[PDB]
Ligand binder design. Structure first.
Ligand SMILES: Nc1ncnc2c1ncn2[C@@H]1O[C@H](COP(=O)(O)OP(=O)(O)OP(=O)(O)O)[C@@H](O)[C@H]1O
Ligand SMILES: [Mg+2]
Ligand code: NA
Lengths: 343, 43
């Protein structure tokens, strides 16, 4: 219940070197305590950010999201060299703005704020990162200098600023990365085509947004590569099909048909009728995964089937929770891809 | 522990279950739920 910052740094060193047993259970308990200390400052920064976003946009169209980083994610990060007490994002906030002008207007307001929470670092990623990621991160230290008997002194909270198109790119990257099982963050090796697809589309997003303007020769060669990579990967089709399958599993009638503890697969199939089409979503228990794969290969071999996809329900659930407006984003990203490919 | 997704076939498609409309193959399809797990798309 009462662990000092020295005990927490020492608990994090234990997980890095690979502890086990009772030693591991004490280390994880101290780290969970440290994780819980970020809850109040996370929610405080979220209201601070919502109050500042309502000032820059009187229409109230800025979407604000927040998340406390999961214990399992923190534990995995330490055993893969980031220091636990140097981590900037145990608590993280995000503001999604309409355009770059709105983005810079919100950044200026947060930077000019006179509060006890200090921006220790401003990360300008308006020129995309090697992944294709673009936006702005603000690394806050809550109750930085004015402390006393405050348990929340120097609590690190991350603030992400993004436009709708930068967010549509990031949502599409998370959907593909999760559902295709390509570990893009996990490793810097493998899937060079998918890596290059997301980098070039990212560069073209920051160009269209006005975040980082590329010259005309670069636009032309990037569009040629984008058309090539997209055909090889079938990005627009995979992105549409995944979104369509996710949309159907949210149906109310479908959810009562489900077994109460469903934790297996969903088989989404579309076929021609004897112009008319039949769409079905078939639930499968986790134990029936071999039966689900067999039924998927039968639909893949059928010429009357246009859509055939197998999706784990737990992955669908977490993507819907992380991205409430996932369908608006995948639609926008697919339209953006068509504008650059069909030039 | 299981594979999050296995993609075999797909097309560019959008569906809105509030409006009960679907868009694919350059056409507009009216959606109707036949059973809890089954739908039909008609011209
Ligand atoms: N600042 C933030 N505000 C809101 N949501 C965030 C923020 N940072 C991450 N998320 C989202 O929370 C979800 C969980 O992500 P997770 O914590 O596992 O990894 P990550 O923070 O994105 O990256 P990393 O582990 O490389 O530092 C993702 O959908 C991610 O986009
Ligand atoms: Mg992070
Ligand atoms: Na979203």
């Amino acid at each position: 219940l009462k662990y000092s910052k020295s005990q927490i740094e020492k608990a994090a060193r234990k997980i890095r070197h690979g502890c086990e047993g009772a030693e591991r259970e004490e280390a994880i308990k101290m780290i969970q305590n440290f994780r819980e200390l970020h809850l109040y400052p996370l929610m405080l920064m979220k209201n601070h950010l919502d109050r500042a976003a309502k000032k820059v946009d009187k229409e109230n169209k800025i979407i604000v999201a927040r998340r406390l980083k999961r214990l399992s994610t923190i534990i995995d990060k330490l055993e893969r060299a980031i220091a636990l007490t140097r981590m900037q994002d145990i608590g993280g906030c995000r503001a999604i703005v309409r355009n770059i002008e709105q983005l810079k207007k919100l950044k200026d307001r947060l930077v000019k704020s006179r509060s006890k929470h200090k921006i220790l670092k401003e990360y300008d990623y308006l020129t995309p990162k090697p992944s294709g990621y673009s936006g702005i991160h603000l690394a806050y230290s809550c109750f930085d200098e004015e402390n006393g008997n405050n348990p929340w002194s120097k609590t690190k909270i991350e603030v992400q600023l993004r436009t709708e198109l930068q967010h549509a790119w990031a949502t599409s990257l998370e959907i593909i990365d999760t559902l295709e099982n390509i570990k893009l963050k996990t490793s810097n090796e493998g899937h060079p085509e998918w890596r290059r697809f997301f980098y070039l589309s990212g560069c073209l997003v920051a160009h269209d947004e006005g975040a980082c303007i590329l010259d005309d020769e670069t636009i032309k060669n990037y569009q040629t590569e984008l058309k090539t990579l997209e055909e090889a990967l079938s990005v627009r089709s995979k992105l549409s099909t995944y979104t369509f399958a996710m949309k159907l599993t949210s149906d109310a009638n479908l959810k009562k048909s489900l077994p109460k503890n469903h934790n297996g697969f969903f088989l989404v199939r579309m076929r021609n009728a004897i112009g008319k089409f039949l769409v079905s979503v078939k639930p499968f228990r986790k134990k029936e995964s071999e039966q689900a794969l067999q039924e998927l290969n039968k639909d893949d071999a059928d010429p009357e089937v246009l859509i055939a996809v197998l999706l784990a329900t737990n992955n669908i659930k977490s993507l819907k929770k992380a991205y409430p407006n996932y369908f608006g984003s995948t639609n926008q990203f697919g339209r953006f891809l068509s504008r650059h490919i069909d030039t | 522990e299981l594979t999050p997704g296995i993609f075999k076939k797909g097309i560019e498609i959008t569906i809105d279950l509030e409006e009960m409309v679907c868009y694919h193959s350059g056409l507009t399809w009216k959606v109707k739920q036949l059973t809890n797990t089954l739908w039909s798309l008609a011209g």
